[PDB]
């Protein structure tokens, strides 16, 4: 199965080397991610020499490899079906290749977080927010991976989800690897982004559900492309998950001098960065709109 994944990954790579794609070198870059994923799988296999049956039984690893095969087939099939539209930036098929690149980036980050050094550590994974940790240990103990439905019902007991439509918005926010499971790593990422835990889902409602500035699955170059249309409107800004620093936010904005910059707020929650940035005249027009949410 592992060798079937390599040949599928290999095929995606060859599809992505087509000069017609004019494929942007910036993260997330499938030409980096796939060989990096291969190298890391190679590392895991090497540490499990002999004890290959322990590895082959690990629940997380089983879910991982299944998703990897499924994502790589889905990418192959996207080229097959999209044909010439793969080359028109702005085509839906091309947008889907970008979303897939992001999903591969999230998969590799999750793999590395669960198998750092190639040995399974999902059961000893250290959850960043102490409140969030305590919820995970209480409901799931030392499990690495739980089905969406089962994550949803446990979370709902402590932080009520308003509606099925919000549950689905929530799922597409937290399930970075897009596989209907929630890992302890994905949980850590979400609860870092949307802390504090005490108001977790109201934070996420304010920052993502009702905020026009939030860009679910958007890369650095897509932010830059999107703000380009607001180049004559200084104070326009949008924000999103950083791809390369998973767990932290990236804000893109148009300066009065006609630059498009992106920054990763530190030592300041998103909430405060956004409010300060409003007040200082930098973050005024979320996705170029005249009206800005009041996050106070």
């Amino acid at each position: 199965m592992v060798e079937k994944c390599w040949k599928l990954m290999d095929k995606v790579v060859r599809l992505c080397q087509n000069p017609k794609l004019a494929l942007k070198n910036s993260p997330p870059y499938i030409l980096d991610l796939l060989p990096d994923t291969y190298q890391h799988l190679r590392t895991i296999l090497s540490r499990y020499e002999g004890k290959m049956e322990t590895l082959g039984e690990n629940e997380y690893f089983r879910v991982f490899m299944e998703n990897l095969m499924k994502k790589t087939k889905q990418t192959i099939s996207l080229f097959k079906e999209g044909k010439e539209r793969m080359y028109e930036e702005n085509s839906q098929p091309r947008r889907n290749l970008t979303k897939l690149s992001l999903i591969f980036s999230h998969m590799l980050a999750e793999l590395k977080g669960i198998f750092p050094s190639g040995l399974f550590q999902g059961d000893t994974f250290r959850i960043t927010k102490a409140d969030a940790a305590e919820f995970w240990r209480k409901a799931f103990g030392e499990k690495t991976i739980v089905p969406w439905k089962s994550f949803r019902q446990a979370l709902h007991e402590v932080h009520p989800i308003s509606s099925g439509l919000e549950a689905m918005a929530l799922k597409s926010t937290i399930d970075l690897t897009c596989n209907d499971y929630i890992s302890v790593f994905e949980f850590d990422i979400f609860t870092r982004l949307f802390q504090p835990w005490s108001s977790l889902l109201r934070n996420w409602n304010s920052l993502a559900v009702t905020h026009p500035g939030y860009m679910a699955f958007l890369t650095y170059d897509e932010v830059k492309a999107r703000l380009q249309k607001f180049i004559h409107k200084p104070g326009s800004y949008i924000f999103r998950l950083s791809c390369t620093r998973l767990g932290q936010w990236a804000i893109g904005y148009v300066t009065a001098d006609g630059n498009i910059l992106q920054t990763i707020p530190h030592n300041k929650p998103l909430f405060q960065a956004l409010i300060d940035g409003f007040r200082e005249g930098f973050y005024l027009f979320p996705d170029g709109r005249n009206q800005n949410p009041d996050l106070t």
Partner: peptide
């Protein structure tokens, strides 16, 4: 190492 340009905030 392949990175995008992230710079200091305003």
């Amino acid at each position: 190492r392949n990175t995008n340009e992230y710079t200091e905030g305003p």
